[PDB]
Design an enzyme around this catalytic site. Structure first.
Site, PDB file in Angstrom:
ATOM      1  NE  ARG A   1     117.198  56.240 -17.229  1.00 36.74           N
ATOM      2  CZ  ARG A   1     117.334  55.542 -16.113  1.00 36.74           C
ATOM      3  NH1 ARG A   1     116.447  55.589 -15.117  1.00 36.74           N
ATOM      4  NH2 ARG A   1     118.401  54.735 -15.922  1.00 36.74           N
TER       5      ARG A   1
ATOM      6  CE  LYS B   1     112.985  53.093  -8.696  1.00 33.71           C
ATOM      7  NZ  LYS B   1     114.138  52.189  -8.991  1.00 33.71           N
ATOM      8  CB  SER B   2     113.694  53.502 -14.373  1.00 34.03           C
ATOM      9  OG  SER B   2     114.155  52.605 -13.370  1.00 34.03           O
TER      10      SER B   2
ATOM     11  CE  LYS C   1     114.041  53.033  -2.763  1.00 30.35           C
ATOM     12  NZ  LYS C   1     114.392  52.880  -4.211  1.00 30.35           N
TER      13      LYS C   1
ATOM     14  CB  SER D   1     125.348  51.640  -9.100  1.00 30.28           C
ATOM     15  OG  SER D   1     124.092  52.219  -9.564  1.00 30.28           O
ATOM     16  CB  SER D   2     123.698  50.818 -14.448  1.00 32.94           C
ATOM     17  OG  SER D   2     122.388  51.021 -13.868  1.00 32.94           O
ATOM     18  CD  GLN D   3     120.348  54.197  -9.710  1.00 32.40           C
ATOM     19  OE1 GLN D   3     120.654  55.051  -8.856  1.00 32.40           O
ATOM     20  NE2 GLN D   3     119.245  53.480  -9.647  1.00 32.40           N
TER      21      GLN D   3
ATOM     22  CD  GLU E   1     114.271  47.453 -11.888  1.00 28.35           C
ATOM     23  OE1 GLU E   1     114.527  48.436 -11.160  1.00 28.35           O
ATOM     24  OE2 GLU E   1     113.660  47.586 -12.964  1.00 28.35           O
TER      25      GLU E   1
ATOM     26  CG  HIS F   1     120.026  46.691  -5.432  1.00 27.97           C
ATOM     27  ND1 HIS F   1     119.160  46.065  -6.316  1.00 27.97           N
ATOM     28  CD2 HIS F   1     120.967  47.262  -6.210  1.00 27.97           C
ATOM     29  CE1 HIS F   1     119.551  46.270  -7.571  1.00 27.97           C
ATOM     30  NE2 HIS F   1     120.675  47.006  -7.517  1.00 27.97           N
TER      31      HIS F   1
HETATM   32  O1  LIG Z   1     118.745  53.768 -13.422  1.00 33.17           O
HETATM   33  C1  LIG Z   1     117.774  53.192 -12.876  1.00 33.17           C
HETATM   34  O2  LIG Z   1     116.619  53.682 -12.953  1.00 33.17           O
HETATM   35  C2  LIG Z   1     117.926  51.940 -12.130  1.00 33.17           C
HETATM   36  C3  LIG Z   1     118.981  51.172 -12.468  1.00 33.17           C
HETATM   37  C4  LIG Z   1     119.295  49.869 -11.785  1.00 33.17           C
HETATM   38  O3  LIG Z   1     120.324  50.189 -10.765  1.00 33.17           O
HETATM   39  P1  LIG Z   1     121.722  49.292 -10.524  1.00 33.17           P
HETATM   40  O4  LIG Z   1     122.431  49.274 -11.872  1.00 33.17           O
HETATM   41  O5  LIG Z   1     122.448  50.107  -9.419  1.00 33.17           O
HETATM   42  O6  LIG Z   1     121.168  47.956 -10.107  1.00 33.17           O
HETATM   43  C5  LIG Z   1     118.011  49.309 -11.160  1.00 33.17           C
HETATM   44  O7  LIG Z   1     118.439  48.220 -10.294  1.00 33.17           O
HETATM   45  C6  LIG Z   1     117.335  50.385 -10.306  1.00 33.17           C
HETATM   46  O8  LIG Z   1     116.276  49.773  -9.547  1.00 33.17           O
HETATM   47  C7  LIG Z   1     116.797  51.459 -11.253  1.00 33.17           C
END
Ligand SMILES: O=C(O)C1=C[C@@H](OP(=O)(O)O)[C@@H](O)[C@H](O)C1
Length: 424
Positions: A28, A23-24, A410, A167-169, A311, A340
């Site tokens: 992207r 998915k990630s 999901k 969140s890294s996002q 995750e 989350h």
């Molecule tokens: O950039 C991404 O694809 C994700 C980053 C992570 O988020 P967090 O850093 O908010 O946990 C991961 O937990 C999420 O399931 C997918």
């Protein structure tokens, strides 16, 4: 809705499993393909793309912004321009990647875009990224869902400081669009505790594959120079995080599960994943472009730091609950999981204790004492990974039923069929 009875494994699981795309990585590639097409570089195809709710929400989000995304199976082609219609409204569902990666991209248009999402999504962190966009010159109405991004056809870029501890996002979403800001972007994470380093590195790696210059040589800081995004073909890897749910079946049953198409070098945190499995004395081998995991005859409690790979917590928590009786396992580094899909620390605690287990939430994780479990209804909280954790438990506990196995759509709509074929 009917529950889904989790099949038991009265004998070791033995199976070859193919899991669909990451998915990630898929989401992207969709954003980078959208940027290339919007820059006039042409169409891009993503091969092996995951088809799931989170990636359908992303491709519908790009179409809301005016792009075209074709493809009925795993091959998606992105083309067109960012040219949103009047009243454009992106549905984020419960997809963090749409919520966090599309508002920047959308700042590239000259038509504002409204963002909304599921009721449950409105509880997830987003305000620090919206403040960062305002600092970069973007008008943004709202500090949570629903919010509107009033772009001007341009985004200036420059330097911004952001707290991305939740969140890294927030960092990845800014980085993905940054090469299209006039001056690029320098992003600084302030303070500490930045989770999910592999997912920010995933972003940097895919930007370089698209020809974008990104300097990540200093921790907590990223510099992206303005420049084109190539329109290239993307090859998507299998989702290794979902693979772990299946590999867990080998671990708890003393069986053997192989995952096909495992990458020997990955844009995902493969090395973290294989190391955790080896912590439980599973034997892990690469063979035939596949990964084989043979479970041990038993395993005791373990301590695992999941800060980089949060995750994995629902599957790893299920593994801890099924360790030898009296074992204690500590999962740490994961305070951010409170934000989350659901608060996963609270939910895992609640559902394990409902089955008679012993799981204690801590300030940054869980302490789990393996104790005999009993039948119950494992609730998914609309969270694909809670649902799959219930499946892992039910391998070793008869009478466990997941309330909403369809939560797996999901990132893995075929999970029930794949799981059934694996357990046989
Ligand atoms: O950039 C991404 O694809 C994700 C980053 C992570 O988020 P967090 O850093 O908010 O946990 C991961 O937990 C999420 O399931 C997918």
């Amino acid at each position: 809705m009917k529950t889904w009875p989790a099949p038991t494994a009265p004998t070791p699981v033995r199976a070859t499993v193919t899991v669909p795309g990451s998915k990630s990585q898929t989401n992207r590639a969709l954003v980078l393909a959208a940027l290339a097409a919007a820059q006039g570089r042409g169409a891009s195809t993503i091969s092996g793309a995951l088809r799931s709710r989170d990636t359908e929400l992303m491709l519908d989000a790009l179409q809301t912004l005016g792009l075209r995304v074709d493809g009925v199976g795993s091959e998606l082609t992105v083309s067109g321009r960012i040219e949103p219609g009047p009243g454009a409204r992106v549905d984020c569902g419960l997809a963090g990647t749409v919520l966090r990666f599309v508002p920047p991209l959308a700042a590239l248009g000259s038509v504002p875009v409204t963002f909304d999402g599921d009721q449950q999504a409105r509880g997830r962190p987003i305000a620090p990224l919206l403040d960062a966009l305002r600092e970069l010159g973007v008008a943004v109405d709202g500090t949570g869902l629903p919010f509107r991004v009033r772009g001007n056809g341009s985004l200036a870029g420059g330097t911004v400081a952001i707290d991305a501890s939740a969140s890294s996002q927030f960092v990845s979403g800014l980085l993905l669009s940054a090469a299209s800001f006039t001056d690029g972007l320098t992003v600084q994470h302030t303070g500490s505790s930045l989770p999910s380093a592999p997912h920010i590195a995933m972003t940097a790696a895919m930007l370089r594959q698209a020809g974008v210059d990104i300097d990540d040589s200093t921790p907590n800081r990223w510099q992206v120079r303005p420049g084109p995004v190539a329109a290239r073909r993307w090859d998507i890897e299998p989702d290794l995080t979902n693979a772990v749910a299946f590999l867990s079946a080998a671990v708890v049953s003393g069986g053997t599960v192989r995952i096909t198409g495992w990458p020997r070098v990955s844009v995902q945190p493969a090395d973290h994943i294989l190391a955790i499995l080896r912590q439980l004395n599973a034997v892990v081998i690469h063979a035939d472009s596949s990964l084989e995991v043979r479970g041990p005859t038993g395993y005791d409690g373990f301590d695992v730091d999941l800060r980089a790979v949060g995750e994995l917590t629902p599957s790893v928590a299920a593994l801890a609950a099924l360790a030898s009786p009296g074992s204690v396992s500590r999962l740490s580094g994961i305070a951010h999981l409170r934000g989350h899909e659901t608060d996963r620390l609270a939910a895992l605690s609640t559902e394990i204790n409902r089955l008679g287990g012993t799981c204690r939430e801590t300030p940054d994780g869980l302490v789990i004492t393996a104790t005999p479990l009993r039948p119950g209804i494992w609730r998914a909280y609309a969270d694909h990974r809670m649902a799959m954790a219930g499946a892992i438990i039910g391998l070793r506990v008869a009478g466990v039923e997941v309330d909403d196995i369809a939560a797996t759509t999901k990132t893995l709509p075929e999970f029930p069929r794949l799981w059934a074929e694996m357990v046989g």
